[PDB]
Each structure stands twice: as C-alpha cells, then as structure tokens.
Enzyme design. Structure first.
Site, PDB file in Angstrom:
ATOM      1  N   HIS B  52       0.913  -1.110   0.000  1.00  0.00           N
ATOM      2  CA  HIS B  52       0.000   0.000   0.000  1.00  0.00           C
ATOM      3  C   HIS B  52       0.982   1.195   0.000  1.00  0.00           C
ATOM      4  O   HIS B  52       2.024   1.128   0.715  1.00  0.00           O
ATOM      5  CB  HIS B  52      -0.839   0.410   1.254  1.00  0.00           C
ATOM      6  CG  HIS B  52      -1.878  -0.597   1.565  1.00  0.00           C
ATOM      7  ND1 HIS B  52      -1.582  -1.654   2.408  1.00  0.00           N
ATOM      8  CD2 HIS B  52      -3.145  -0.785   1.229  1.00  0.00           C
ATOM      9  CE1 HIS B  52      -2.608  -2.460   2.527  1.00  0.00           C
ATOM     10  NE2 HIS B  52      -3.556  -1.941   1.824  1.00  0.00           N
ATOM     11  N   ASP B  55       2.476   1.961   3.456  1.00  0.00           N
ATOM     12  CA  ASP B  55       3.188   0.882   4.123  1.00  0.00           C
ATOM     13  C   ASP B  55       4.693   1.293   4.009  1.00  0.00           C
ATOM     14  O   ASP B  55       5.467   1.179   4.956  1.00  0.00           O
ATOM     15  CB  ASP B  55       2.979  -0.495   3.547  1.00  0.00           C
ATOM     16  CG  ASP B  55       1.600  -1.115   3.595  1.00  0.00           C
ATOM     17  OD1 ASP B  55       0.903  -0.679   4.516  1.00  0.00           O
ATOM     18  OD2 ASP B  55       1.190  -1.971   2.761  1.00  0.00           O
ATOM     19  N   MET B  86       1.610  -6.400  -7.589  1.00  0.00           N
ATOM     20  CA  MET B  86       0.393  -5.689  -7.243  1.00  0.00           C
ATOM     21  C   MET B  86       0.823  -4.616  -6.255  1.00  0.00           C
ATOM     22  O   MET B  86       1.729  -4.743  -5.431  1.00  0.00           O
ATOM     23  CB  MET B  86      -0.610  -6.734  -6.742  1.00  0.00           C
ATOM     24  CG  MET B  86      -1.910  -6.200  -6.238  1.00  0.00           C
ATOM     25  SD  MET B  86      -1.778  -5.399  -4.665  1.00  0.00           S
ATOM     26  CE  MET B  86      -2.012  -6.714  -3.450  1.00  0.00           C
ATOM     27  N   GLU B 179     -11.680  -5.616  -4.205  1.00  0.00           N
ATOM     28  CA  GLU B 179     -11.706  -6.582  -3.117  1.00  0.00           C
ATOM     29  C   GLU B 179     -12.852  -6.347  -2.095  1.00  0.00           C
ATOM     30  O   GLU B 179     -12.946  -5.383  -1.365  1.00  0.00           O
ATOM     31  CB  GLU B 179     -10.364  -6.607  -2.466  1.00  0.00           C
ATOM     32  CG  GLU B 179     -10.189  -7.604  -1.354  1.00  0.00           C
ATOM     33  CD  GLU B 179      -8.906  -7.560  -0.612  1.00  0.00           C
ATOM     34  OE1 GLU B 179      -7.830  -7.163  -1.016  1.00  0.00           O
ATOM     35  OE2 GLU B 179      -9.024  -8.001   0.510  1.00  0.00           O
ATOM     36  N   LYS B 181     -15.481  -7.175   1.004  1.00  0.00           N
ATOM     37  CA  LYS B 181     -15.485  -7.374   2.460  1.00  0.00           C
ATOM     38  C   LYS B 181     -16.909  -6.877   2.855  1.00  0.00           C
ATOM     39  O   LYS B 181     -17.335  -5.785   2.412  1.00  0.00           O
ATOM     40  CB  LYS B 181     -14.350  -6.661   3.129  1.00  0.00           C
ATOM     41  CG  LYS B 181     -14.086  -7.195   4.548  1.00  0.00           C
ATOM     42  CD  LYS B 181     -13.108  -6.478   5.434  1.00  0.00           C
ATOM     43  CE  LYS B 181     -12.817  -7.158   6.747  1.00  0.00           C
ATOM     44  NZ  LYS B 181     -11.772  -6.386   7.464  1.00  0.00           N
ATOM     45  N   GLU B 215     -10.960 -12.516  -1.207  1.00  0.00           N
ATOM     46  CA  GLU B 215     -10.121 -12.967  -0.067  1.00  0.00           C
ATOM     47  C   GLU B 215     -10.933 -14.032   0.617  1.00  0.00           C
ATOM     48  O   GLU B 215     -12.128 -13.976   0.803  1.00  0.00           O
ATOM     49  CB  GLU B 215      -9.676 -11.908   0.892  1.00  0.00           C
ATOM     50  CG  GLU B 215      -8.887 -12.350   2.119  1.00  0.00           C
ATOM     51  CD  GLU B 215      -8.404 -11.128   2.875  1.00  0.00           C
ATOM     52  OE1 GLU B 215      -7.695 -10.314   2.231  1.00  0.00           O
ATOM     53  OE2 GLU B 215      -8.782 -11.065   4.047  1.00  0.00           O
ATOM     54  N   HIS B 218     -12.709 -13.047   3.860  1.00  0.00           N
ATOM     55  CA  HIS B 218     -13.775 -12.064   3.583  1.00  0.00           C
ATOM     56  C   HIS B 218     -15.077 -12.713   3.159  1.00  0.00           C
ATOM     57  O   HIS B 218     -16.147 -12.434   3.790  1.00  0.00           O
ATOM     58  CB  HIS B 218     -13.277 -10.999   2.618  1.00  0.00           C
ATOM     59  CG  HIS B 218     -12.188 -10.147   3.161  1.00  0.00           C
ATOM     60  ND1 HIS B 218     -11.672  -9.100   2.406  1.00  0.00           N
ATOM     61  CD2 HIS B 218     -11.554 -10.085   4.336  1.00  0.00           C
ATOM     62  CE1 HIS B 218     -10.748  -8.464   3.098  1.00  0.00           C
ATOM     63  NE2 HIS B 218     -10.643  -9.077   4.271  1.00  0.00           N
ATOM     64  N   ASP B 243      -6.556 -13.445  -2.814  1.00  0.00           N
ATOM     65  CA  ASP B 243      -5.918 -13.264  -1.506  1.00  0.00           C
ATOM     66  C   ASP B 243      -6.275 -14.539  -0.693  1.00  0.00           C
ATOM     67  O   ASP B 243      -7.495 -14.759  -0.555  1.00  0.00           O
ATOM     68  CB  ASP B 243      -6.339 -12.069  -0.765  1.00  0.00           C
ATOM     69  CG  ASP B 243      -5.905 -10.687  -1.051  1.00  0.00           C
ATOM     70  OD1 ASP B 243      -5.136 -10.476  -2.002  1.00  0.00           O
ATOM     71  OD2 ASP B 243      -6.413  -9.804  -0.290  1.00  0.00           O
ATOM     72  N   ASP B 253     -12.338 -10.011  11.172  1.00  0.00           N
ATOM     73  CA  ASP B 253     -11.397 -10.506  10.121  1.00  0.00           C
ATOM     74  C   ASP B 253     -10.123 -11.016  10.771  1.00  0.00           C
ATOM     75  O   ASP B 253      -9.322 -10.169  11.217  1.00  0.00           O
ATOM     76  CB  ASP B 253     -11.180  -9.341   9.172  1.00  0.00           C
ATOM     77  CG  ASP B 253     -10.435  -9.647   7.952  1.00  0.00           C
ATOM     78  OD1 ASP B 253     -10.633 -10.724   7.394  1.00  0.00           O
ATOM     79  OD2 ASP B 253      -9.654  -8.830   7.483  1.00  0.00           O
ATOM     80  N   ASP B 255      -7.673 -13.192   9.510  1.00  0.00           N
ATOM     81  CA  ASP B 255      -6.483 -13.126   8.617  1.00  0.00           C
ATOM     82  C   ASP B 255      -5.407 -14.099   9.051  1.00  0.00           C
ATOM     83  O   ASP B 255      -4.203 -13.741   9.166  1.00  0.00           O
ATOM     84  CB  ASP B 255      -6.013 -11.665   8.560  1.00  0.00           C
ATOM     85  CG  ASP B 255      -6.677 -10.856   7.482  1.00  0.00           C
ATOM     86  OD1 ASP B 255      -7.465 -11.364   6.690  1.00  0.00           O
ATOM     87  OD2 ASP B 255      -6.484  -9.655   7.293  1.00  0.00           O
ATOM     88  N   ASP B 291      -2.673 -12.520   2.165  1.00  0.00           N
ATOM     89  CA  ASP B 291      -3.012 -11.264   2.962  1.00  0.00           C
ATOM     90  C   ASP B 291      -3.460 -11.814   4.307  1.00  0.00           C
ATOM     91  O   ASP B 291      -4.654 -12.125   4.362  1.00  0.00           O
ATOM     92  CB  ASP B 291      -4.025 -10.461   2.157  1.00  0.00           C
ATOM     93  CG  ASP B 291      -4.702  -9.270   2.839  1.00  0.00           C
ATOM     94  OD1 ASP B 291      -4.141  -8.795   3.856  1.00  0.00           O
ATOM     95  OD2 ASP B 291      -5.753  -8.734   2.409  1.00  0.00           O
TER      96      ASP B 291
HETATM   97 ZN   LIG Z   1      -7.232  -9.129   1.184  1.00  0.00          ZN
HETATM   98 ZN   LIG Z   2      -8.985  -9.933   5.685  1.00  0.00          ZN
END
Ligand SMILES: [Zn+2]
Ligand SMILES: [Zn+2]
Ligand SMILES: [Zn+2]
Ligand SMILES: [Zn+2]
Ligand SMILES: [Zn+2]
Ligand SMILES: [Zn+2]
Ligand SMILES: [Zn+2]
Ligand SMILES: [Zn+2]
Lengths: 393, 393, 393, 393
Positions: B52, B55, B86, B179, B181, B215, B218, B243, B253, B255, B291
């Site tokens: 990102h 980041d 990406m 993406e 969510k 994802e 998600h 993802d 979430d 992850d 991710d």
């Molecule tokens: Zn993701």
């Molecule tokens: Zn997530």
C-alpha cells in the site's frame, strides 16, 4: 391503516396455506381450499394472489382434475376481482429434484425440469401475470466435489436463457425474476445473494427480461443489509419484484411476518420503497409481496391475523417513513451529514484525471488534518430516524 | 515441499510487517524495515512483494524522504530479484477517510481520495505491477439513513472509471481488482461479496480492465463458500488476483495463515486453482497472494515461521489435490455421481424450447418416480476427498 | 425523556472517552479529560461513572501522579455528585497480556495480572463501588492446541477465588461480576456466553459473591436471545450488573447506542428490567450501565449526543413497555396465549411422579389430537407488542 | 480403520432410518425396518443402537403392537449382540408439542409430556440403557413476549426434577443428559448452549444424576468452539454422553458425517476424547455416538456408506491424534509455548492473597516490557498439528 387494492399487497397460496410441516414435525393445520384463500384475502384488502404450479395443481393430477381445479380458481378470481401478478414453478418438492432441476447432474431430470418450466410459462401467461419467478432452492451441494462449478452455471444459463427465448418467441408480457437464497435446503445454493444474481444476469444471452426477486430474510441469512442489496438492484434497474417478511438472525429461513424480524431494517426498506433515494433515482413500482409462513403454533384465526399483520405493519411503517422525511429537523440533519453532497459528482464538468491530479488544491496542498475535523453527526440523524419510527416525534 | 519463485507466492509488506495493534491493544512487535522484508522473503522462496502506498512511504513524508525510501526499496529488489506484481492504496487509515475515500459524503475528501489513487497508479506502473487492487474498507455506514445509496454507487463508479480511463490514456499495463469485504471497519461495506463486485463491474464504462481480488476470510465472514464464489468469478473471466488466508467463522477478520481456518474449503480452493474444472473451462494464472497477519502472541521467529507456513500449507494441499484427481477410484466415483454428465448441454443440437416441450419422453411420459431412484453417492465421493486430504490414501 | 439521577444511568469513562482507533485506523478525536468527563455526564443527568484502572491512571504513572490524578478525580465527583458504582481492571491492552492475564501460559504474567487486580480491589472499596467487573478479553486462543483446556479453567478459578477470598478477608462491600464475550480479540474467548459464565461460577469456592455482567452485543455475536439470557441470569439470582448497547448482527463488537441495534429485543429487554415477569418473581434493581462507543465519523458534539441518546432510548422504550403491559387488550391476549397458565405447576399439590405416572386424564386416556387444535395466537400477541412499540396503540 | 465393538460406536435408529423429508421436500428413501437396522449396524462393527420411543413404537400403537414390536426388537439385539446404551423420547413431532413438552403454555400438554417421559424411563431401564437423553427441541419461542421466561425455567426444572426423582425412586441405574441446541425448530430454544445447560443443572434438586449430551453441530450453530465447550463440560464432570457429526457454518442443523464439517475442530475433538488433557485431569469414557443424517441425494448404498464413514473418520483422526502427541518435536513445541506451564498454580504453596498481594518480583518491581517479548510460538505449534492431520509428519 386499512389496506386497499391500491396498496398492491400480494400473497402466495403457499404462505397462508402453509400447513405447518417442518423438519422436526407434521402439519398442525388442515389443507387450505384455494377458493377459500382467494375469497379470504380479497376481504382482508389484498390486491392479488400468486402460486407455484403444484400449490394448485397436484403433480399427479389427471386432465379432468386440472381442468376442474382451474375452473374453480378462475371462478373465485372473477367473483372477487383478485389479479394473479406472479406465478412460479415448484422444482424442489418431488424426490426427482433432490439434486436440482436446472442444475441436476442427471441430464434427463434437467430436461423434465425445463419442460415443467416452459409449460408453466404458458399457464402464467393465461393467468395475466407480469412476473415469472425462479427460486433455484435445490441447485447447489452439501459437498465441494459434488459439482463441476463452471458446468453448474452453464446449465443454469441454458435453462434461464431457454425460458426467456420462449417468452420472446411467444410474445408474452413476462419478465423473469431470480430469487437468491444462500443455503437451505442445500448446504450451499448457487447464486446465494442479490450480488451473485445480478452478476449472472449479465452473462445471459437474453438478460434484458431477467431481473431479481430479493427476499428480506434470505439476504439476512448471510448477514447482509437488505436495504443496501435492493438499492444496488434498483441502481442497475433490475428490481422486478420483492418478497417481504421477517428474519431474526443467521439461522434457518423463518419467514416471519414483515416487521416481525429486524424492525429498523424494515423501516428503512419501506422508506426506500416509498420515498426513493434522497437525491432522486429510479423508484420501485411492482407488487409488495409477502412470502411468509404463519407460525405453526397458531390455528386458522392466527393465519388471517398474520396476513393482516403483514399489510398493517407495512402501512404503519410507511406513515412513519413519510413523517420522517417531511420533518424539517430531519432534512437539516441530512444536509449537515452531507447526504445531499454525495449526489454532486466528484469531478467538475469536463475535468479529466490529469487535470485533477494536477489541481494543487485537491492533492498537493489539501489540508487532510483540517478536512478530518468534520463532525458527520450520523449518530444524531439515526436517533432522529428511531424517534420517528417509535412515533415519539 | 519447498517453494520456489515458480510457485508465484506473493506477500504484502503489511502482512509480515503487521505490528500487532488491534482494537483492544498496542503493537507487540517493533516496526519492520522494508529492506529487511524484501531480503527475508526472498530467502523463504517468495516470488514477489506487494504494498500500500503508506506501508512504504509515510503520509507526511517530504520529497527527499520519499526518494530515499524508494532508493532503498528498489536497491533491495535489484539485489534479491523480487518482482512487485500488485500495488494498492491506503484509503482507510488517516482520520480524513473516516466516511470513505471515493464514497465520502464530503466532496473535497472524495477528490483528495481520487488524487491519491491516480498518483499511486503512476508509482504502480514504475514498479512493474500488473495489478492495481482497490479495497474500499471505509465505504459504507453504521446507520441506514447516513447514505443516499444510489449516489454512493455513482460516486464509486465515478472513482473507479476515472482510474481506469487514466490507465488506458497513459498506456500502462494495469488491471484493477476490486476486493470485497461485508463489514469491518464499517458496520456494512458497499459491494460486500464477490457477487456484488461482479455486478458493479458490468455498470462501469471501462469494466473490461476491472475484475476481482477475492479474499478467503472475507467471503467466509458472510458465511459463503469461497470455492463457489471464485468459480463464478473465473466463469465470468474476472478472476484477476486472489488473496488467501484462513478464517474460523463469522466474526472479526482474523487473517490467519492459509489452511489455518476451514481446511476442507482450502483443499477444494487449491484443487480449483491447480486442477481447474472437471469438464474444462478457464484456469487461474496469477500470483498466489497471502493477505494474513502473524498472530500478535508471536515474536519475529513466529513471523517468518507463519510466512513459511503459508507456502508449506499450499504446497501440501496441492500434492494431495493432484493425488486426489489422479486416483482411478476418485475418477469412477465422479462419473457415478454425474460430475461429467453436468457438462453435457440439456438440449440436443438445434432443439428449441418448443421442440422440448413437445418431446413426450422429456415431460408428458417422463417417469419422475423412476428417475428419483438414482443414488448420486455424494457422501462417498466426499469421503474419498477427505481420505486423500488426510493422506490415508 | 429527561433522565434524572434516580434512573441510575451509569456510563464508563472509556465510552465517551473512546477516541476512535479501530483495527484499520487511528483515533479521530482528541483525548477526553476525566474531570471534563465527570462534569459533562453529571450535567446530562447521569447517576454515576465507572472506569478501568488505566482509564484514569496511566500504566506507568508514579505514586506521585496516581495521587495527583485521584485528587482532581475525587474533587469532580465531589463538586458534581456522581457516584462510582463499578470499577474494572485493564488486563488486555499492554503487550504483556497478549496471551491473557489470569490464564496466561507464562506463570509470571499470571501473578502480575492477579497482583494488578488485588490492588484495583483496594481502589474499588475506596471509591464506594459496589461491583468489581472482570472482562477476560485476552483469555482464549486462535488455535485449538495452544492451551490445556482443563488447566485454563483451573487458572481462571484460581484468579477469581483468590480475588473473592481477598474481598471477604478485607470485609469490602463488593461483588465480582464476570463479563462474557464469545470472541474478539481472541479467536475464541473462555466463558463465551451467559450460560458458560453462570456454569463456571458454580465451581468456585467463593461463588456466593460472584455473578454476571451480560452485555447486549456480546450475546448477539453468538446469535443468542439477549432477553432469554438475562432471564436465566436473573432466575439464577446472578444478575449483578448489566451492560446495555446495540449490535446489528454477527460481526465485530459494534458497541452502538442502546436501541440502534436490534430494536424489538431492546424493547423486551427494557420490559424485563422495568416490569420483571408476568407471573411474578425476581427483579433487577441495580444500575443501567451503558458500555458503548460513539461512532468515529462524528466529532465531540456526537459524543454528548450519543450519551444523551442512550438515556432517551431507554426512557422512550420504558414508556412504551409500561403502556403495553397496562393495556387490557394485551392482558387478555396474554391470557388466551397461556402466559399466566405457564405459571401454574405441572403437578397437583401433593401429586407424586407415580401418582401422576402420567395420570390418564394425563396419559392413557388423553386426547392428543384435540389438545393440538389450540390456537396459541402468539402472532397476534407479537403484533400488539410492535404496535405498542411503534406508538400506534 | 476397521471399527470393532470395543470402539464403542453407538448410532441412533433415526440417523440411518432418516428418509429425507426436510422443509422443502418429501422423503427420498423408503422406511427402514428396525430389525434390518440392527443387523446392518452390527455387521458394520457398531457396539450399540439408541432410539426415540416413537422411532420403534408408533405414537398410536396399541399394547398388543408395542409387545409384538419389542419382541422382534429384543430378538435382533439378541441375535447380534448390539447393546442399547441410550434411550430418548419424542417430544417434538406430533402437533400437540407445537409449543413444547415440559414448557408448553398449556398445562394439560405439560402433564401429557411428563407422563410420556416417565413411561419411557421404565422402557430405558428394561433395555439396559445407562443414559436417558432429553432434547427440548420445541421449548422456546419465535416471539419474545410468548413466554414468562422465569416460569418457563421453573416448568423445565419441574419436569427434569420429577423424572430424576423417579429414577432415584425406582433405583434405575440411569443418568439424564440434556442436549442443547440454540434454535431450529423454535426461533430461540431454552438452554441453547453447553454453558446454559450446565448452569441450569446447578439449580435442580436432583442435579447429581443430570449432565449433558453436547452435539458438534449445535454448538457450531452459535459459532462456538466445540472442543472448548466439551472441555468445560468435562472439567465440570458433567460430560455424560456425546453426539458427533459435521456442520459447515451458521445455518440449519446439517447433521453431516463426523469429519465432513469443520475438520481441524474434529481433529482436536478426537484428541480430547482420546488423549484428554496435556497436564492430566478428567477423561471421557462413555460411548462415541453419531447423531447425523445421510444426505437425501443418495440411496441406501449411501446410508451404509455414510454409517461406515463416521467410524472411519473417527479412527483416521484418532491415529493422527495419537501420532501428534507422541511426536517429540510437538512435545518440545508444547514446552516452548507454555502448555505445561499453564498447569502450574499461579500462587506458591502457602502463598496468600496478602502475601502475593502481588509480591514484587510479582507486581511493583516486575518488568512488564521484558515479559512481553516472549515468543509464545502458537503459529508453529498450530502448523505441527495440521501436518500431523494431513499425514505429512
Ligand atoms: Zn485481502
Ligand atoms: Zn482480511
Ligand atoms: Zn421468497
Ligand atoms: Zn424465505
Ligand atoms: Zn462490546
Ligand atoms: Zn461491556
Ligand atoms: Zn443436529
Ligand atoms: Zn444430537
């Protein structure tokens, strides 16, 4: 609040005729005569009646039998003035449909299923219906290797596009409305939410006469916001019909009376059906249909009670929703929160990407910390909405 | 199982660099130097790195600062050979984005947001990325009257189509991957599932270079089947990136590491990425991106452990998935169940609606009760799959 | 509306003081001074304020700052009259509690957590708090083999029984109340629901002074009926405190205003706190505490708006719930449905199991088919509560 | 594989005998004769069979048919050697139980339900069953005002205490085990989880012979950790029986084969039944009962396939769970993570709350920042269980 046919309240035969049989028990009520369903609903204020081919005509009915049943039903309709605005097919109750109709793994079943739909399009058209709903309830699987998932969608597409070509060819004034459900009876149903239905339609050869039939409890079974989902269906101009009821959580399909589930969400759906979007946009005009089941604890006085509760709930919500938007205080709150600023396009007339990136004011010298200070006051606009819903305002 | 760059495993900077700050606590780990992220991941077997804008480059970084950071990062990349496939934008952490970037109610915020994306498209293109991902995490609401829902989608569309026109105009080899969510950080996020993303794309002026980035956790946050959802994305040829991670239920979430959530669902996703569809169909070719977030209980030995666990899990699942389909017993079971019959079209070549309705054999004299006797044996095909997953076969 | 000190509306310092850092972002509001917090609350009509140790006294504060801070804090309490009815400890933000407090795998962190609690017990007594709350937010795991599940319950028992034993030892006029949460921040939290918390209290040595502090949102995160769960807490005589707020669905803990989540459940929650049971029984007479968080999109005007709305919503609901029970048509609807009849014992005074042994009048000669026709009329009964809630009756 | 009678695999008659009528359809399989059921089970390697009263003896059967049916049933048991370890009563299919059995609003139905149970207790004793199960499937409501929530728990207590008291009175060697379910068929069922069931048993008079019968799927319908819930049941010494099956997600009760739902949770469930706790403690030694239903898409070959798969899955998991605990790298990973350390008491032998009063070595002079760096390495530890489960180690 008293419903009149002008209200456009529609009920399925299977809703007030639901006999009570669930997964852990037998029926608690006697079967409903269709003639009586028609007459009863006309005295409550209904606009029309809707049914599945086998709600009316038994699977195994001979021709004499079919003919009588239809003569009885058409009689009832003439006597009361009830319209038949939507007709649907039962592709889930006989054992033959255990793996689906359109997406069965067995090819002869797939053809019977499609044959059964085409014949039903004919009937629908003789009845004067404008909508043909498809609820693919047995399309899907319990297990992930049971299906070739790309082939499941081609089969679906083949079915739905053959049904649509036939409408176009016959000159019938029918539109197809797909109805999503994420699970039950199968562990996972194909095209589980409004989103998946809308996507699929764009891959269809004849998608112009194919749209959605969202059900309030169905989108809530995946925990989504029903009001957001129908807003995307409306935005794409694909909101052809709508099924209203109540659901109290992520669990089996309850099919409660509209307003007997998530209240605030019901209020906001009525506000969207009745007031449209704050800045203007398409508006929904079809039937306000109730696909619910009278709780099995209740006898027949309970059934007509529940039917009436559906139209009452809606009318009460509507009165509040209209008072809500007409309140000056509510309109001021809306402006403050930027509900009307959302409707202004981001770019200026004939400003391109390049011109925007280069506007100094918009990026390089934008004071992000300062812009972050706005108090949207969303809490306060929600409080005003609840206060109009409780009629304390 | 040992990953090689040929495997195409990609990781975000924010994944191994996730410091531990959650809603109920502060970071438990020190910040990760990007140079070190690059070098570490190259020794584990990674193919590439993703990030990102913030980041890497702080929101408030001066030009000298930005330049150094980039010189350090590009150095690291040259030394190790890592690709940057990406690049994404952060439109959710600064306070300015509290109501969204693209769908903020405030118009000046909407323009800063879009300005911030365009600039980032430039960077992405200098880095050699093929994909530009958009995660609209602050687009949505806690309350139903906070938004003009039709205007929320027009604003979204305006943003995404301006970003796409700019790619086309600049001649950049970039595709946009949205993406989904369903919730978190907002109570309801716009375009909540693969279904809603795919729909929205069809209303875009430049939807040809706009596709999805699903994802695993998600789609599982709404209780859907990840494997069914990517199968519809693949079927519409809109699976641009993916993802992978793990989620254990409908909740925040998580992850987790890929395979650390729903195992059987992971197995079946790997089977779809690696074997494609049973009857043939498009196949996914991009990066296999993770991710995820290393649990906050673990120190840095834990972080590289977790990173490695992602590529291991996938390779182990892949070995089982390939053995599964190569087994003769499994192929026999598949045939029995009609997994290959699903791939034959329902109608015969040049047979129309009319011709089908009239085939006597297909409807009028179809023996429904007899056809209902087939034993699909889906239980047994699922048992064989589990047995190959547990490597007991 | 118009809340007054006799309403017993208590608010935590962390609620109005909640600055807005969530998982995907930084705080959007400036820190709230505690003395300021006390004055604003008192002027809105609150009866008391509650806090976590670290809410007022920094984790690092020296002895000299503890007493300076307490000085001003006590003066404000003094100047305004707010009471301090509940106190609680922070065992979750500092990185040292990443695997828990009382059930931390590390023994030295278990001791440190217990030591922190013992000292917070002395501050609670000092303030006049009647309740000491325990929210075990980091007690749990992401992974099933991370813990010895029996030893985790033995280490939880040890901590609560040592703390209880110390209350009894010092003769403080304090009760412990456990606060269940099913997940977040841990993937799985121990004692995730009211049942689990209730069951757990029965295995302690010092059970007599230990009870619960159920929170609306948290049972709603497991999809459970909040009123059913408080009923059982009350029936058990273990409902020592209550946390009121709003949650829309199974997702992250939203902590919305009371009434902005499931509105009909909030209605029935207020009916149980205010009216108790239809047939007579226990009543909850402690404070009405709000454990919520002001949406991060809104400024400080939303913070005080959001605190007033909690209070309003509880009084608007209270009003409608008093009119509902008082209504003679509701009382009669209640009689028809068997609500008063559930109140009668099954067995006759003196009837034994052998006597009844089902008696038949109660077994052998019982007409099951005739008893089955009873219309319970639960739908009509629900329709009367909703019209009472909508302000319609 | 190869299940043998010492495995203690018990199966209910309603599982393999489940004909396939769900909410949207009729049965897809012919009725299964009970004598046939016994012979097939015994030949697959089952140890025993369980049933509901009405599973074997029709609700309407005369005295003469009860004894004819029991005659053949006892002979089959005799000819094969199956034991009858558990018996249960049907208080949910007949329309008379539409508002419940024990908590029915109608008093004459409460008496009829209790009478039915008392007589079923005499048949249980007669068969040699050690456990009498109670699934209150219709105890609950769709609507919050349908019940007096305190009286519903008083009427539930009355029924279970009368039945328990009668067991003690006749000196039967029987224990009662309650089976929690959060919903379906009622919208909300009373005692919806293990916690609630556990808490409830502590308020009975005859609590000593009352315990639980948790079912995998049912805690998974509230999103809870099934292993965490059985741990707490076991820790409390109330784990009297267990029902094993599969569930994929929060939705209707699927009753899949054990292992075809959440596979990693099934792994850890088998680890707790077979290995117990890492540090030592209680063990579950009763039967491994399967409460599942063969998918309706499959014929009778699937029914016996599905029954063998339950058994296989439990032995494949058992095998991998024995190798996992035995592995020296796992044992060491376990030590690093603090699993054995959780086993040590927090307080030193003889240490008082004042003594510790946090000691400092445990409070004042404790280095919180240094204790916080500990790597618990839970991720590595989870990766070792999954490779053990995948057959990789
Ligand atoms: Zn993701
Ligand atoms: Zn997530
Ligand atoms: Zn519907
Ligand atoms: Zn429905
Ligand atoms: Zn909370
Ligand atoms: Zn709370
Ligand atoms: Zn079940
Ligand atoms: Zn069971």
């Amino acid at each position: 609040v008293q419903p009149t046919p002008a209200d456009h309240f529609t009920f399925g035969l299977w809703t007030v005729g639901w006999t009570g049989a669930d997964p852990f028990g037998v029926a608690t009520r006697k079967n409903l005569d269709p003639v009586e369903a028609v007459h009863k609903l006309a005295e409550l204020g209904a606009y029309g009646i809707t049914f599945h081919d086998n709600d009316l005509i038994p699977f195994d009915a001979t021709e004499a039998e079919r003919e009588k049943i239809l003569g009885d039903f058409n009689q009832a309709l003439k006597d009361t003035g009830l319209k038949v605005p939507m007709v649907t097919t039962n592709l889930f109750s006989h054992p033959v449909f255990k793996d689906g109709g359109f997406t069965s793994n067995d090819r002869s079943i797939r053809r019977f299923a499609l044959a059964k739909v085409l014949h039903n399009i004919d009937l629908a058209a003789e009845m004067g219906a404008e909508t043909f709903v498809m609820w693919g309830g047995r399309e899907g699987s319990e297990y992930d290797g049971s299906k070739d998932l790309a082939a499941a969608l081609d089969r679906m597409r083949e079915g739905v596009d053959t049904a649509a070509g036939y409408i176009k060819d016959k000159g019938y004034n029918l539109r197809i409305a797909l109805e999503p459900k994420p699970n039950e009876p199968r562990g996972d149903i194909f095209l589980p939410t409004v989103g998946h239905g809308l996507a699929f339609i764009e891959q269809l050869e004849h998608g112009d006469i194919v749209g959605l039939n969202p059900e309030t409890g169905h989108e809530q079974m995946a925990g989504l916001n029903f009001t957001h989902g129908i807003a995307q269906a409306l935005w794409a101009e694909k909101l052809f019909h709508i099924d209203l009821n109540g659901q109290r959580g992520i669990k089996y399909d309850q099919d409660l009376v509209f307003g007997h589930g998530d209240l605030t969400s019901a209020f906001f759906t009525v506000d969207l059906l009745e007031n449209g979007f704050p800045n203007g946009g398409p508006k929904y005009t079809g039937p306000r249909h109730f696909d619910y089941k009278p709780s099995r604890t209740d006898g027949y006085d309970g059934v007509w009670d529940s039917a009436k509760a559906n139209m009452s709930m809606y009318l009460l919500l509507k009165e509040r929703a209209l008072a809500f938007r007409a309140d000056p205080e509510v309109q001021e709150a809306m402006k403050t929160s930027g509900v009307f600023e959302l409707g202004e396009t981001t770019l200026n007339a004939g400003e391109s990407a390049a011109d925007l990136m280069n506007d100094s004011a918009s990026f390089a010298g934008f004071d992000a910390e300062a812009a972050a200070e706005r108090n949207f006051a969303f809490i306060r606009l929600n409080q005003l909405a609840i206060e109009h819903l409780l009629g304390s305002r």
